[PDB]
Design a protein around this ligand. Structure first.
Ligand SMILES: O=c1ccn([C@@H]2O[C@H](COP(=O)(O)OP(=O)(O)O)[C@@H](O)[C@H]2O)c(=O)[nH]1
Ligand SMILES: O=c1ccn([C@@H]2O[C@H](COP(=O)(O)OP(=O)(O)O)[C@@H](O)[C@H]2O)c(=O)[nH]1
Lengths: 272, 272
């Protein structure tokens, strides 16, 4: 299946880090050939589950989120959307391509809901067919390809406000009394809670660990500074991800524009 | 466990490709922090088996190969050397560091011996404790660190004579009648038969496939142009490796000097 030969003596990128110091790829445009990856993943009949929460007024974001996911997310691969909502009847009936299904799961501090709910759900036997789970915010739209290049045992996503920051500027939980605590001299990246995922087993492990950490902090009267993102960051510090997604995958154009290191804006915040 | 923070806006290398188009790291100096990797691998009590053939006059290369492996190969990790030889009594008694053991396996066209022998051996139950297998040439010496940065499910090594070559210059098997055949318009890299490895299961699969391909070619009266390296290259074309080692890991300084893209010469050919 012919494609350009890789060029050993030409860097993929001269302006960004494309592999972490523990040899996990950092996924930017120009670092992958999607035709090779699509083949690898279709040979395994890869099924991707996508979880999204749309609780209270956030059910209004589902229409664009699902319409644009159908244009850009994992097209050609098997996809199952799992929409967690307090308003199942408000979920828009969006037309889906072949091989793609959607289920609505009704949901009943609430800071723990996402990690609690994904943890319980990720352990269910009806996921036997799903290979990877991906968890994203709903108040977002896809604008360009998000595909199997992201898939791996465990991935997080560089927060778009902090990718250029030094670690002491990262808003990690800094109180030693919290289970999310990270010392000022530690930290590889600051990951955003709005896009993470991995194999079902790695997502079971991450969401369990985060939910259990959050319950310990609650018992102790402490709420981490950025809630489940704080616990995501302590988790991925100690269990390093096998791919890191660049901020192409989680961007806010109104806040941050279209800077030179972004060749594509793939999944972006919806305003107000 | 503190180490420098990764720099998102600084490339690891500006002179070489450090990730393949299917997102496998290509391992060069400055792309890994061995302290992070050593920790990950020691947490799993990683045991590395190293196979080497020393048949006929090549038993003379074992002394330096094992003395320098003790200085540079996987130091701190569990290592078991498996020396395949027709002269077990000629194997030098080299003093080994703690956690490192050596076994001698006596061996009885012969072009098939390496893939046949590693295939049979890799399936034995006494490997239950070994996590990865690495297969190298004996007429070589280690000069610098070769460590757990190479470990992964499946890896090959860029041939030091061809890393700068275009694919039509690669000495793949080009006859359609051989099981090793690769079309002129296909090929990612040219891997050398002198350093490859992976998990035990991936090495079982690669050496079986290569041995079975070689037996088909023998039945058909054809010998691939570069023998088991030709079949290694067809295998890794179709089953792409999860890391690629740069030519730091397989070099010939007498032939090729110390060019600018090599920051370290880690495992090099012994002359004449
Ligand atoms: O270091 C690189 C360079 C390119 N590519 C990808 O391989 C394909 C072809 O790359 P090329 O630069 O040759 O693009 P072309 O000029 O043929 O359009 C595209 O999907 C690139 O993003 C890659 O994965 N790593
Ligand atoms: O893109 C990079 C840059 C550095 N490192 C490694 O991380 C460690 C520290 O890197 P640094 O450049 O900060 O070296 P220092 O100047 O502190 O000696 C060394 O093992 C480097 O090879 C890496 O894995 N990827």
């Amino acid at each position: 299946m012919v494609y350009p030969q890789p060029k050993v003596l030409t860097p993929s990128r001269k302006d960004v880090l494309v592999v972490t110091p523990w040899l996990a790829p950092i996924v930017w445009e120009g670092t992958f050939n999607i035709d090779i990856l699509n083949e690898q993943f279709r040979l395994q009949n890869t099924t991707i589950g996508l979880t999204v929460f749309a609780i209270k007024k956030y059910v209004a974001f589902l229409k664009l989120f699902l319409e644009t996911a159908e244009k850009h997310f994992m097209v050609g691969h098997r996809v199952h959307y799992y929409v967690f909502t307090d308003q199942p009847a408000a979920v828009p009936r969006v037309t889906l391509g072949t091989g793609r299904q959607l289920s609505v799961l009704e949901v009943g501090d609430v800071s723990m809901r996402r990690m609690e709910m994904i943890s319980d759900f990720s352990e269910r036997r009806f996921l036997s067919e799903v290979d990877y789970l991906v968890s994203v915010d709903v108040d977002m739209e896809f604008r360009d390809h998000v595909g199997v290049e992201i898939l791996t045992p465990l991935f997080g996503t560089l927060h778009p406000s902090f990718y250029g920051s030094s670690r002491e500027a990262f808003t990690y939980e800094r109180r030693p009394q919290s289970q999310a605590y990270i010392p000022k001299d530690e930290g590889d990246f600051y990951y955003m809670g709005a896009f993470f995922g991995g194999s079902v087993q790695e997502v079971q492990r991450l969401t369990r660990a985060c939910h259990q950490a959050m319950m310990v902090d609650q018992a102790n009267g402490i709420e981490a500074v950025w809630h489940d993102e704080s616990h995501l960051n302590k988790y991925l510090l100690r269990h390093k991800p096998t791919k890191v997604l660049s901020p192409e995958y989680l961007w806010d154009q109104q806040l941050l524009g279209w800077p030179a290191v972004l060749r594509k804006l793939r999944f972006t915040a919806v305003p107000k």
